[PDB]
Design a protein around this ligand. Structure first.
Ligand code: NA
Lengths: 276, 100, 9
């Protein structure tokens, strides 16, 4: 299938409690593979998946150096953004940044991303053209003029079309036995009576990877979107994910309800009903 | 300034069977800002070695974390997750529901 | 691999 690499940066100030913390994590699809935390005793980019451990010291030293520089630049950036919003020195604030690339099954760049938020709201984002910006407000317009003057879009575009695509392809090959393996969900339907009039049908999906999945309930072949309760997909702890969908049905109408499961590990889509 | 309160799910890595080793999970998501306190409770008492995942965030910028520890369920024992965050007046406690 | 450290905001 198609694949993605993303780096997630969080920089968090904490006035009176030391300098702002900088954390970076790298993902391929739903697999984390590196982390950096400026609060660590020896801050370094560290492995978090086995297929990255083979990279050499030149790799780890470049990734560590860039992250230590990033620690300082994001500290400066939190001061700058506090000024841009006329904010007190006593408050805690957060810059977030996610960037990376999507490639198709042939490894060709589908698109690149670079987006930033401040205290949880969109701040500035590189446009899909990898050459223009979208500033959310007049404070972010300052960053944009700073970034146009430093031709930042060109440096990000070069990364997104170059290293990002190239290293993602390398990781996918080095970790092909996991990153390129889709595990289908294990499924089952449970029945839990609510009253004498109704019962809950819950359609379970367990042990699947990647996280992308479609679980839906149908009544007489019609989707029950507005009446279906879907939990947020959740991690099991072993790389796989879990999800369930629930629908409340009249007692005795259970057979009119079917659960439909779509996942890329599945040879064919699944249709499930309660087997009493 | 806008804050988001955490969502909480408590569940086992594998289907629970008494006397068999497993992992208890407390998944906290959808929250902002990122400071959160999460404890796993065995019959009300905090469990000691509880690891957690590296801080990351979803597409809407909200944070998520998985707190987890190895355990062996029994019919007697009761497990739960206790979460505090700036959006909550008091710690929220969510019990492990086994049939789920 | 990470992107080169960029310009402050
Ligand atoms: Na609180």
């Amino acid at each position: 299938g198609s694949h993605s690499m993303r780096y997630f940066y969080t920089a968090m100030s904490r006035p009176g409690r030391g300098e702002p913390r900088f954390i970076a994590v790298g993902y391929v699809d739903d697999t984390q593979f590196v982390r950096f935390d400026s609060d660590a005793a020896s801050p370094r980019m560290a492995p978090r998946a086995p297929w990255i451990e083979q990279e050499g010291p030149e790799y780890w030293d470049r990734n560590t150096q860039i992250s230590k520089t990033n620690t300082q630049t994001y500290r400066e950036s939190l001061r700058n953004l506090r000024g841009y919003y006329n904010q007190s020195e006593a408050g805690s604030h957060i810059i977030q940044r996610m960037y990376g690339c999507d490639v198709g099954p042939d490894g060709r760049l589908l698109r690149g991303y670079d987006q930033s938020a401040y205290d949880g709201k969109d701040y500035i984002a590189l446009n899909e053209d990898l050459s223009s910006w979208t500033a959310a407000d007049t404070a972010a317009q300052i960053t944009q003029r700073k970034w146009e003057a430093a031709r930042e879009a060109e440096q990000l575009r070069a990364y997104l079309e170059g290293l990002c695509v190239e290293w993602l392809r390398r990781y996918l090959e080095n970790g092909k036995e996991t990153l390129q393996r889709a595990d289908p969900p294990k499924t089952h339907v449970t029945h839990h009576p609510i009253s004498d009039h109704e019962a809950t049908l819950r359609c379970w999906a367990l042990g699947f990877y990647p996280a992308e999945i479609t679980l839906t309930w149908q009544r007489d072949g019609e989707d029950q979107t507005q009446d279906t309760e879907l939990v947020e997909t959740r991690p099991a702890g072993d790389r796989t994910f879990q999800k369930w969908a629930a629908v409340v049905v009249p007692s005795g109408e259970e057979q009119r309800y079917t659960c439909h499961v779509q996942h890329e590990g599945l040879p064919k889509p699944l249709t499930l009903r309660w087997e009493p | 300034m806008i804050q988001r309160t955490p969502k909480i799910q408590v569940y086992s890595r594998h289907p629970a069977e008494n006397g068999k080793s497993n992992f208890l999970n407390c998944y906290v998501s959808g929250f902002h800002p990122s400071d959160i306190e999460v404890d796993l409770l065995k019959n009300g008492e905090r469990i000691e070695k509880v690891e957690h995942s590296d801080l990351s965030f979803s597409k809407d910028w909200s944070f998520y974390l998985l707190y987890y520890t190895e355990f062996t369920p029994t019919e007697k024992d009761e497990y739960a997750c206790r979460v505090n965050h700036v959006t909550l007046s008091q710690p929220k406690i969510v019990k492990w529901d086994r049939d789920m | 691999t990470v992107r080169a450290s960029g310009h402050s905001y």
